[PDB]
From TrEMBL, chain F:
Residues passing through the membrane, by range: none
Keyword Glycosyltransferase set for record: yes
Source organism of the structure: Thermus thermophilus JL-18
Domain (Phosphoribosyltransferase): residue spans on this chain: 36-161
Keywords: Glycosyltransferase, Transferase
Protein's name according to its UniProt entry: PRPP-binding protein, adenine/guanine phosphoribosyltransferase
InterPro entries attached to this UniProt entry: PRTase-like (IPR029057), PRTase_dom (IPR000836)
One Gene Ontology term of the molecular function aspect: glycosyltransferase activity
Amino acid sequence: RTYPVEIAGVRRELPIVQVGPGVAVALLNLLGDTELTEAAAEALAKRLPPEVEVLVTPEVKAVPLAHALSRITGKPYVVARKTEKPYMINPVSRQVLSITTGKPQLLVLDGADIPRVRGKKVAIVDDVVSTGSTLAGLRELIESVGGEVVAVLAVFTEGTPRQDVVALGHLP
Amino acid sequence: RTYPVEIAGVRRELPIVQVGPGVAVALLNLLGDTELTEAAAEALAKRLPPEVEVLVTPEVKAVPLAHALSRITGKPYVVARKTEKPYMINPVSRQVLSITTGKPQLLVLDGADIPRVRGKKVAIVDDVVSTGSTLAGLRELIESVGGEVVAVLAVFTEGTPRQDVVALGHLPLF
Amino acid sequence: RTYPVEIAGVRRELPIVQVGPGVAVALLNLLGDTELTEAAAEALAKRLPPEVEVLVTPEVKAVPLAHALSRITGKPYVVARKTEKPYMINPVSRQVLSITTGKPQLLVLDGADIPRVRGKKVAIVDDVVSTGSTLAGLRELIESVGGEVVAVLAVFTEGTPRQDVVALGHLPLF
Amino acid sequence: RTYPVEIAGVRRELPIVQVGPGVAVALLNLLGDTELTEAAAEALAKRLPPEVEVLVTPEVKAVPLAHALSRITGKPYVVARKTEKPYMINPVSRQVLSITTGKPQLLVLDGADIPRVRGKKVAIVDDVVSTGSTLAGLRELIESVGGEVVAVLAVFTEGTPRQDVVALGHLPLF
Amino acid sequence: RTYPVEIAGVRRELPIVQVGPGVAVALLNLLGDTELTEAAAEALAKRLPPEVEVLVTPEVKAVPLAHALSRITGKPYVVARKTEKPYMINPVSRQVLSITTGKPQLLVLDGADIPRVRGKKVAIVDDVVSTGSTLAGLRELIESVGGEVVAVLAVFTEGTPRQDVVALGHLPLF
Amino acid sequence: TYPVEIAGVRRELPIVQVGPGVAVALLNLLGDTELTEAAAEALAKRLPPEVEVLVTPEVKAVPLAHALSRITGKPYVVARKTEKPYMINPVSRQVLSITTGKPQLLVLDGADIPRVRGKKVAIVDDVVSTGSTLAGLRELIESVGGEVVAVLAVFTEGTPRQDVVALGHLP
């Protein structure tokens, strides 16, 4: 049915979704929930290890997180995408860098974004850091681009990965 | 090379791509850019008709704007997508709405968002209204739901405003 | 996935649930939707003969259409229920009028609403006229009490009446 | 026998019953009574705090009250029920949220309705407030969603103020 | 000792019965007078103001008047009594409402009759409307319950009464 | 409770004991303009032409006898269960009485006595059960000067040893 969560005094009741069949897998949904998104951003900002330089987030529903967390902390963010995007082999998102992921997936940073991360202490930022699957792939992408991953932050964790995170909560 | 725009005292040199025959407009990418997004939203916030009750966009580079517009305006926002998104045919983002487009496109509202937009004075917000071949279909998805588009907002118009708009500048085609 | 419909101006995308193993629907309820209720009621009031003196609905969630139709038109409305609803074996209400249905169900008229029906010309009001498994029974309480049914009004139908229905539109399967 | 009252220029003599054993309670039934209903709605709409954005009621007999109040205030209403309601098992009225309440009851709030309560300042509307455990329960339900209760309305407070309702009259116990 | 009178062109000789010789009550009886009741009711029907929904008479000799008036006019009528009548504190004639009067009497609407009066435009019907206590008694009983008295119909008036009327003539006391 | 039919018109006349017992279903014609009109036109077929005048007792039978009187075109007369306003002063003539097993003690108002004395009479009522009034009334109509050729009604109740070729029956 539905799963209780609250972040910094904002209460919600997430719908349990099936990707893994039957289990208690809460759906997080920042796209269109401004009040959740800032309450997450305020609470995650104060966990942000001091002087960190650049935030990095993969596609879907963390860009309102990263923006709002970017706003609070005066620090840029970068959106890697789950695919190569319109106008990439072009002068507009010029020279995309790609790598795979174990469960077929393909994380990519715009070439225009590599100079904001290279040489920098990177904080990876995601709405949910789940199995630890795309995370390892993401980290090596950044480390092949120049970047030093210092801190990973999220709204929630889910299950038991090989990489540690800074979340408020945890979802089964 | 690199077109110079000024948006609420924000100089950004936006990179130029040719989608038509030779003609070329700069692509706003509001994703990496925390400063432009908040410049634009504060600007656009002043020009929202007070009687607007909810903001709408498509998923891509623009949702930084609708969020920033929602924060300052107090009014919620709703994100249409180019497809039924992963975890949309699942027991969760269920019963999605769908239409098609004359430009190569498709525009979906999630079923779980029809309960805002229903009977509501809607304002479309996008990063750039191009042809706005997307824009036509957005009004037909919104109106589908029971929605009442009373505004159409963007950081930029391009070519000219295809149906009735107010924005923050117009973009040429190099 | 969804079915568009409309009533005098008011268009809605209605989700396609399923009740049983075969068919789907289009789901309609008037409960938290004021505007569709209002637009339903005035439109149906144009199709009310003046000879109807009272309006009978069987449970929620048609009561907002019954409430509104009564107001615009001026004539009373009566809510039949699925059970002996309280406080109805007491000095307040007593002596409910039951009847079978099939579906496995009861249709009850409060004792104090036989006077609102007895001697009178009656219009059944409902949201959707599905089969009418909860309708011919309705008739045979109205008829028992004293009322004589001269009109079925629903927002919607599913095949065509079975028992003749003035309805604002029609709804397929899947 | 029966207890008199008047509500906003409408006179009624309302019957008595065993709610508690001896303590004999006035019965207020806005079902079927459009005039008492609509006279109440108008005189409670003037009392409404303007920053209330949505109305919520437990079951009938307040959906006449609440729809009416949606009409005249021009803002949505939502309807909790005593059970998960058909649409129940095949989820479209999906993922319903429940809370128990210690005078044997579920209050349940349909899943389609949480995008309407969430982030919204809310007012409860009842026909008759007394226990204050159903209402405290409803507060627990609303708050669950992301909602904020900022006001309680009713026709009649009864006994004495537990939670501080903004009523029209007030009832004794007989 | 007799009072001649012409009522809608029917001639009668009313007996003059003792209040006391001087103050001479001339009494009309309709119990058994088919020609007069029909004439009087056909004459008052052309005089019924057309917002009227229901007719209410006090107990006694006035019901052929009310009957004959409901029939040609096409709306119901109610008969208040002077005492508790058989089968009242039961599930039959459930829960009569009361009030006393000055001039020697008590007045009682059967509970099964308040649904036919509640929220309606009532016309009072009597054979002879006279002083005040009995009419004002019936007025307060009507409006207790939720009726609005919008007319007072009668064969005669008498004195020049405490309330205001449409009638076929007027009676002194000699 | 006990559902009925009177030439179309259907009703649920509700339960209350005068019997032990059982559960008796009151008619009151005072409520219902349609039923009365339905039972009066349906009782209007039954009348003999030998009837020239209708007589009742107080209860719920004056709407009936009125409508019946309207369509047949013959008078009706009402007798009263008890005393009425100013019944020893001039307006309301004096009793003829009988004391039944039922707690009852009945009267007529001889204002009407010229309308009966010499004419052929018929009784109408809303229920006939024990027939408490019946012989008494009939003796009052003897006492005056009229012959009772018939005892019409809406409803027979029980199995009245009287000839009440009615419209229907109740337990």
